[PDB]
């Protein structure tokens with residue numbers, strides 16, 4: 001199974017700069033990149049060449065945080081702060097997933113939107129419902145894209161119409177794990193406690209045991225809202241900071257861990273994140289829409305902390321990680337300005353790096369056009385943006401700032417075209 | 420000329436709420452709204468009905484600040500704050516408008532982009548060049564959209580490739596004024612000193628005299644960047660604040676005046692703005708892109724200050740005022756958070772109000788569906804956004820957050836369809 005793609009390649013091997021290869025070739029064998037060069041090796045001559053001409057080829061987007069079950073509230077109900085917000089629109093929407101048919105329907109729309117926007121790998125929070133989450137697993141597997149799917153664990157202080165017993169929660173979680181742990185190579189389970197204020201100690205310890213037992217990655221929320229933070233230290237008077245409680249249960253780095261937002265994290269929480277090698281998911285659109293605050297990304301990057309990007313949909317108003325890239329840069333420009341121009345804002349390559357190679361690394365060797373990497377890619381047709389007047393770097397930047405899904409001509413995950 | 424439109428009408432008579440009229444009629448005579456009602460009067464029973472069915476009809480977008488000559492820099496060169504950005508990217512690009520053909524080509528692309536995005540009235544900054552600006556006037560008159568066009572006055576501390584002397588600057592400005600202060604009814608001239616840092620006392624004085632003589636509106640920039648502000652106090656050592664400099668020369672409210680950004684305005688400047696009935700043009704996208712800062716919109720609205728929106732293109736990355744609306748709201752949410760939640764963020768209706776009825780009032784009776792107003796409108800087809808699941812308010816919000824020009828099916832200016 002060999003495929004050869006030709007076009008203008010743009011990717012980031014490192015965060016400081018773009019690697020640009022005009023009219024170059026990418027040879028894919030069994031879904032993985034075997035060769036990337038400006039000249040087609042003779043050992044591959046005679047093979048069909050999928051020539052994308054003057055179009056741009058870039059790696060796919062890797063969204064490390066999105067709530068699949070909140071798709072319907074996209075662009076709606078953003079007049080309340082995190083906690084109040086959940087109670088008014090989010091919980092009522094997620095509760096609807098008790099019905100598997102509603103789930104099939106909504107997740108169907110979600111998946112088509114993700115692919116349409118060029119998201120090739122995504123870390124998703126589903127709902128506490130087992131059957132609907134199982135349906136999401138199957139639909140994702142059928143779609144061809146990669147993903148970490150997490151049945152949501154929430155048994156504490158939740159609404160009567162959207163709550164669960166920790167005993168059932170754990171049994172359902174483990175049941176899901178056993179069913180999908182070895183099924184697909186790109187759609188896998190991930191331990192997903194919603195967050196401290198929603199999980200009892202019983203639940204968290206049980207989830208911690210599951211993560212260890214099955215060597216599974218973890219995902220959850222961290223220091224997104226001030227009131228949220230006050231609730232955590234209130235329920236847990238023995239903790240000095242938010243992330244400490246997760247760590248107490250073995251859900252803070254023992255295995256690859258994703259922590260969303262991390263806007264108001266204290267110095268200690270930051271050090272722990274660094275120490276335990278936790279990955280921070282920067283969700284700028286969500287931070288703006290919910291009025292959560294503005295994350296100091298340069299400060300975290302200076303400390304060597306792993307930072308990726310997430311759409312955090314519903315809270316975040318868009319599935320396009322390209323739009324998330326723009327907002328991350330814009331958010332960083334304000335941090336730069338407030339710091340007296342000391343904390344350099346993000347360059348286009350740095351944010352693009354987060355979206356591709358860095359985020360992709362959570363899923364495996366994906367996110368860059370280098371030998372051995374899965375071929376997750378997008379073909380960008382920017383013919384409506386006067387491309388003739390700009391170099392390749394400017395064209396990618398303009399696609400990011402001025403373009404949209406209309407410019408995405410093709411999607412590939414592990415060498416397979418996704419429709 | 421009589422025309423009758425039917426569809427779901429959404430507009431804002433006031434900023435606090437939307438007026439929604441499902442399947443209602445708008446009768447237009449000679450370009451102005453004759454009536455707006457759920458039922459069509461018997462008087463027109465024989466007239467054809469332009470039925471837009473389930474589509475949405477909203478007034479056009481009124482962009483109160485954009486640099487027409489910067490169209491080519493959209494999406495690129497945003498890695499520098501104001502001053503160095505001007506010296507390195509903007510001035511060099513504007514210098515090319517010495518060539519009238521480059522101007523016709525570039526301005527042609529601009530106009531198509533504005534119309535495509537639903538901007539029906541726009542306040543534009545051209546370049547200091549007389550011939551190219553005259554061409555812009557002519558092209559806008561041909562296009563059919565409304566606009567205030569301003570040859571840019573800049574004679575102080577400007578590069579050799581982009582400067583003029585105040586005498587010639589004033590002569591060309593008056594030449595243009597006499598040539599267009601009657602020609603078109605919706606495309607008119609506006610006094611345009613670029614801003615204090617590049618305008619001599621002689622120029623500003625001469626411009627204030629022209630403004631008074633021909634009773635013309637004024638448009639400029641105000642307290643957008645800290646270094647810019649520092650330059651003004653340094654050049655005008657006796658001024659108490661930036662805005663005072665413009666007022667000294669009669670360029671601060673004697674006639675309708677537009678002042679863009681107003682991010683770092685002092686308490687005294689703000690009071691002068693309210694006192695002199697000056698209009699603040701909020702340009703959120705630009706403020707993020709150049710790391711200028713974040714404008715405190717609620718603080719100004721609480722003082723009863725006039726506030727409208729501008730794309731500020733090039734600095735701002737998009738001609739879509741719908742995107743600008745989203746950004747203004749998001750920017751306000753962060754200000755709300757930093758104010759301990761005391762200064763409420765903008766509601767969708769408030770920002771929409773700025774873009775329509777308020778911004779429109781600067782051009783005349785435009786921006787709302789009420790008797791007497793010019794019929795500037797857009798027909799939104801949101802069929803790709805699962806409209807069947809949302810009410811009209813939600814549909815509009817979803818168009819603002821998730822939609823784009825592809826949902827803009829038709830646009831009208833003064834009752835005439837614009838292609």
Ligand SMILES: Nc1nc2[nH]cnc2c(=O)[nH]1
Pocket residue numbers: 067086090194195221224286312315
């Ligand atoms: N962004 C976000 N944070 C959360 N914390 C708990 N629930 C949620 C949710 O649904 N969205």
Ligand SMILES: Nc1nc2[nH]cnc2c(=O)[nH]1
Pocket residue numbers: 486501505509613614640643705731734
């Ligand atoms: N945003 C912005 N501010 C300015 N101040 C002076 N010139 C400019 C310009 O071109 N853009």
Ligand SMILES: [Fe+3]
Pocket residue numbers: 065067221260312315
């Ligand atoms: Fe989230």
Ligand SMILES: [Fe+3]
Pocket residue numbers: 484640679731734
């Ligand atoms: Fe400007």
